[PDB]
Amino acid sequence: VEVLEVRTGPDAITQIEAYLNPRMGNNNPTDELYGYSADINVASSKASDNPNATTLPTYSVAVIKLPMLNEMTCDTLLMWEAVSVKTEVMGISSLVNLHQGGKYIYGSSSGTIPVQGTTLHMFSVGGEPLELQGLVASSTTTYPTDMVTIKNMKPVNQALDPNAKALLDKDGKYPVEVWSPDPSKNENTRYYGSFTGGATTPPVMQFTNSVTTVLLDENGVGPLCKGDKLFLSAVDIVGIHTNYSESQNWRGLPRYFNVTLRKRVVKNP
Amino acid sequence: GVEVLEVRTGPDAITQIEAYLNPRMGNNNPTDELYGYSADINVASSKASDNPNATTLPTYSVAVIKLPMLNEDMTCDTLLMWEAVSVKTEVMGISSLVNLHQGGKYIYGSSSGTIPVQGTTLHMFSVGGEPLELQGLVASSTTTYPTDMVTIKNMKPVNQALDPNAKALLDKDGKYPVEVWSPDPSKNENTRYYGSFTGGATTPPVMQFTNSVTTVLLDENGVGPLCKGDKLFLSAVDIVGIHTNYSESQNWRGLPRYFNVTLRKRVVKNP
Amino acid sequence: VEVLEVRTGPDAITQIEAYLNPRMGNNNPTDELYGYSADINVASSKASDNPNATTLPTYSVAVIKLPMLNEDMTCDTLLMWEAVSVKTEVMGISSLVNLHQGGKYIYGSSSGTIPVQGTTLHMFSVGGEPLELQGLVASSTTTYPTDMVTIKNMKPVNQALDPNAKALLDKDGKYPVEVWSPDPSKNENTRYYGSFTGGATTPPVMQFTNSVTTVLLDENGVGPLCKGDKLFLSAVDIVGIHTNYSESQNWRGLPRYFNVTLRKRVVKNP
Amino acid sequence: VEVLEVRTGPDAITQIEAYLNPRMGNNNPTDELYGYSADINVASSKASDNPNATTLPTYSVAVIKLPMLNEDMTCDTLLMWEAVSVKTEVMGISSLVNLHQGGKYIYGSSSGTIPVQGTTLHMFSVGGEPLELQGLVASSTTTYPTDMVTIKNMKPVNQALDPNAKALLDKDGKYPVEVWSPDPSKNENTRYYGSFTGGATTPPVMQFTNSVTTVLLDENGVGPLCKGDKLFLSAVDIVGIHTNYSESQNWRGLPRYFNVTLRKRVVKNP
Amino acid sequence: VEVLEVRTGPDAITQIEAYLNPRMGNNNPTDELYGYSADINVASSKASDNPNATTLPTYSVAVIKLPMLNEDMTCDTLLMWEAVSVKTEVMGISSLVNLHQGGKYIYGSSSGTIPVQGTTLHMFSVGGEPLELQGLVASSTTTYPTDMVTIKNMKPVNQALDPNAKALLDKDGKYPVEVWSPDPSKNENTRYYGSFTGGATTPPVMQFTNSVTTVLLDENGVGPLCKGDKLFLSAVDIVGIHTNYSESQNWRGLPRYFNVTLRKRVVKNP
């Protein structure tokens, strides 16, 4: 598609908003531990590593249908162009809680250890599914068959196998420990991520309605919405909650999106 | 709601107000021996039995400042509203934490100083022309909260994530717990809020103080919060960590926040 | 006082420099532990908390007398010295880079000792009058030494904001940091800058350079104006806690350097 | 080579993309622990330090061949490819977000395992020729594997700067990071960017995005010029240490993506 | 001297390059632990603190002779070399990425060893004369080696600012960093830059690149001016502490590279 100029005039700009609930493993709102993974089940060896589906955080994705622009035989066409986004991790202050059941900070007269350890934040806004690259800590891990993982794994999958690719086309199915955004593709998606590891690391997060991320690339062009669909993807692992027994559950939070879009002219292909 | 027009120029078009908000850590009465702290945290015996005391739960601070009356005749084609333009804000008494002799848990053995306030911090301030709009989300949906507080009615496990029906307005001081409510980013068009969180149980608190820094409250259209009914809403929480006692019981510690807001007159189309 | 324009011309600009020695508790240069607090004496209970004056870090303050500007206080306009900018430096930072000082071993008795670490507090201010202070304490039941300046007749309200608990930083080595902090509701004529990191064992972080200048002008382009030709420099630089072999502990402080540039500002005679 | 102006016109710009797999020690794709080092083998003493080749992370390097530019090598001027900018990314970062991999429990046997943490080292470079290296080691008495490229006949001087300990990064997976680093006295024709955080258990920190570009032009507006139409990409990305059940440890590395934009630059015929 | 304008035309610019090897205590290139201090020897007591010379890191300093500018010192104006900018780099950073060196195990005897960590101190300066120093120590009762340059007849005042405790950094490997720091009340003809992070076990953090330049010009557009055509480069780069198996400890340092650009400045003949 040849990309032409921005369409001006009345009714040229639109806004959508949405939220994506976390998919930590307990992904059904009636689950007792909704917004958490099930207790982590650990490998006994290199050869034997069978994590349960409910213990693996996956990416969230939502597809937003935008107003229909083209009533298809005119020489040029219009596509929604995502220009900017306000995005927010909601319920951050829910972590400010030392009375929840858990492992004591000191002895049994103290509060309990709050959610801490590894965090992973990502959001993306694109005009099509986020393109993913496969890479795992162990190629001998047996992943649940009901999830989308790398077929026919080999030790090369512990690094870069150019054959290990996927589309983020299903909510709560693509494990974060298997897939990450592919920087060799994604010409029509903007993604932003941050990771801090460790076992007990204090999580750090901001929240404000004062910040906007601009989605335009170096040519001034934002993601272009193929078939008038807008793809929003996220993961927000905010750490690990430890139970009194010392079993552990990933904790995730929902993410809000507010995207501003405008009409962009393209040449009809 | 209303069609916003241009800024009103001329003499006395600008005003400024200052205020402070005391922390509401749980001991919220100034005669409370531990005013400015929570009571000893009472931990849940089980997920089914989680009954935190009201005095153990930090809540948002809110104050409403009545601004001068702007409109003599409410039938005129245009009217004026106070517009919050910028704010200087400051957490006060930061250096009170620089104290190693306060009763508590020794850093090393009985010859050393005591462990100062540390662990989870939560800082937030907001300036708006109406109550800060809130979204409910909890760590555990089976927690029973004190009934004299404002929390989510008839909680279900969905409330551990985003339930679009769990909405509130921050319309009462020392009543909305931080572990239940956070600013709703899907609303608050007429409020500007700023927040920061660092978790953990022993993390060193980090804070700045100065009178050289101003925050501009104008949105991308150059419009600040517009004060409905001439009321300015200031909200805050400033949990600076946890103090640990000799017995290893623990209290949240908060500090008060100062606001200096500059406002101007904005012309609006009469609805 | 109505503030008018900056006065141009030759000799319109002056510069001063000064240093402030820390006041950690041992505040006499003959004190064996000068630049440290005495061993922290800890409260046995909330009710019984009587810190020794020597264990309580206080603010440093110095008044610099500037060249007299007005030989005739009758003119319709007068001049005031305006603090425009400051280069400031915490001196002796590398003195902390020391693993042999007597103390608590990092590991066992074959290792170096634990260096100064834990809670830090850094503040400097430049003003045309004493720094204005707000009182707030960790515990209202603390009995402070009567020879220090602290809150009179404390009540639990002083654990938060009591609008009546105010003071001026008008004496060196007398106003405890744990009681007093800059009052953001005042200080129209002083610029202050403060940094705090808590914890018991936190690694201290400091920079030192002669390349950095802080501009003191407010949003109207006006710096602090020196009343009666007096410039107020205030500071505290608590760089952490030293631990002794017995596990007793001393606050450690460092001195601060100031180099202030001032210009002549015209004001209407009040 | 006298550098002249940028050649304008259609077809004056090209871009390449490449990925470099990590060289942590297990550097064969059929290695069970490909993308890790083997169990670290520790020195028994100062005198006796024989690390296995498989335990020493090395630099990754790839040479990208660019289109031919000059049909006639006798013309007074010639064209070279000039690297202008690069988008680069550490891939598979989220693979670390894994608490079930076999290893060492965080707490007791009911908990998850400790994820990859400790020392990290990230470096990328883009140049028109091999990255120039300087040799320096923690210990000159270490015996390095003979089929790696290390400093010949070390003496204690090699624990600091020995001006004779120089090399070119001209072999993938052969130059250990613990022996070699970018030489700042050379590398006129390469841009290199490096970041190190030490410690035994430090939480790793990484960002990933497709919104960030690094501009490679020097202070004269000239980027790396590709000699013989070759572009050199070099990298190391050690993301920490994995700890096994027995407490043995493996370095963990991640692959790096490059997307480089290049333009035609006129040079005087040498 | 009165400083006039920059001299333009061909050959008005020059560049020099140099490196400075660390002076951690073992300061002779034939020393087995060159680039480290000897095992820290800790004070028996406050009164008996006698650190060994080889345990005390000192500043590095090099004087570079520049081309002679004035063939006639009779002319009304003279030329001086003016240092305009510097590229500087800590070399060998990746040498610390090494878990096999003999030392203390991270966990038990099957794990790697703890890498260099704890207190770091980084400083570089570029000047037209020796860097001016201020004395300040953790303890005035320390007895320093007499073959080092330290504060004469120390008293407790030297635990803070004594305005008489001054020196010039005029000898390499002689001035202890724990005794001397840059004097911000002087150094009008030197630009210095310093960073400190303390703690016992802190992860060291360092970057390396050839993409960063520091401009040495002051607020008036004048860089350091080289008296007698001599350029002074000073540094210290303590990157942390190595812990041995026995738990004895050695400071670790790295060398620093400088690339300085200078131009010709006109000054009035005195």
Ligand SMILES: CC(=O)N[C@@H]1[C@@H](O)[C@H](O[C@@H]2O[C@H](CO)[C@H](O)[C@H](O[C@]3(C(=O)O)C[C@H](O)[C@@H](NC(C)=O)[C@H]([C@H](O)[C@H](O)CO)O3)[C@H]2O)[C@@H](CO)O[C@H]1O
């Ligand atoms: C009955 C019997 O003896 N069976 C053994 C079987 O135990 C053994 O498996 C290895 O046993 C060890 C026990 O200490 C570990 O459980 C190995 O798993 C790990 C480890 O923890 O060491 C898992 C870890 O994730 C792996 N590291 C990485 C980076 O993936 C390591 C790693 O492969 C090894 O440590 C080698 O560096 O292994 C477990 O594989 C098998 C295989 O040796 O032999 C049977 O006979």
Ligand SMILES: CC(=O)N[C@@H]1[C@@H](O)[C@H](O[C@@H]2O[C@H](CO)[C@H](O)[C@H](O[C@]3(C(=O)O)C[C@H](O)[C@@H](NC(C)=O)[C@H]([C@H](O)[C@H](O)CO)O3)[C@H]2O)[C@@H](CO)O[C@H]1O
């Ligand atoms: C001889 C005798 O029995 N005397 C007791 C006396 O011990 C007791 O005083 C309290 O004793 C406890 C011992 O566990 C502590 O020493 C109390 O001090 C602290 C504490 O460490 O808990 C100091 C601390 O600074 C306070 N917390 C804050 C936030 O300021 C707390 C706090 O007030 C309480 O823990 C309640 O949350 O106290 C010390 O007061 C007295 C009072 O019970 O009774 C005598 O009989």
Ligand SMILES: CC(=O)N[C@@H]1[C@@H](O)[C@H](O[C@@H]2O[C@H](CO)[C@H](O)[C@H](O[C@]3(C(=O)O)C[C@H](O)[C@@H](NC(C)=O)[C@H]([C@H](O)[C@H](O)CO)O3)[C@H]2O)[C@@H](CO)O[C@H]1O
């Ligand atoms: C054989 C004999 O009896 N000799 C003693 C000798 O031990 C004693 O010296 C003091 O001993 C104590 C033992 O706990 C400490 O080692 C003192 O050193 C320190 C300390 O660690 O406490 C060193 C430390 O650097 C100092 N602190 C600061 C901030 O400088 C402290 C400090 O001076 C005191 O703790 C006061 O706060 O001292 C060590 O001096 C001497 C003197 O008591 O008597 C001999 O006879």
Ligand SMILES: CC(=O)N[C@@H]1[C@@H](O)[C@H](O[C@@H]2O[C@H](CO)[C@H](O)[C@H](O[C@]3(C(=O)O)C[C@H](O)[C@@H](NC(C)=O)[C@H]([C@H](O)[C@H](O)CO)O3)[C@H]2O)[C@@H](CO)O[C@H]1O
């Ligand atoms: C069989 C026998 O008795 N052989 C000895 C042998 O003990 C000794 O070797 C030294 O043994 C000690 C025992 O604690 C250490 O293992 C020494 O290795 C280290 C150390 O851990 O101390 C390794 C470390 O990397 C080195 N430090 C640095 C900064 O490089 C230190 C260092 O050289 C010393 O601690 C001095 O500061 O050594 C190991 O060398 C030898 C040599 O003395 O003598 C045999 O006869």
Ligand SMILES: [Ca+2]
């Ligand atoms: Ca591609």
Ligand SMILES: [Ca+2]
């Ligand atoms: Ca909305």
Ligand SMILES: [Ca+2]
């Ligand atoms: Ca006021």
Ligand SMILES: [Ca+2]
């Ligand atoms: Ca060179």
Ligand SMILES: [Ca+2]
């Ligand atoms: Ca001076």
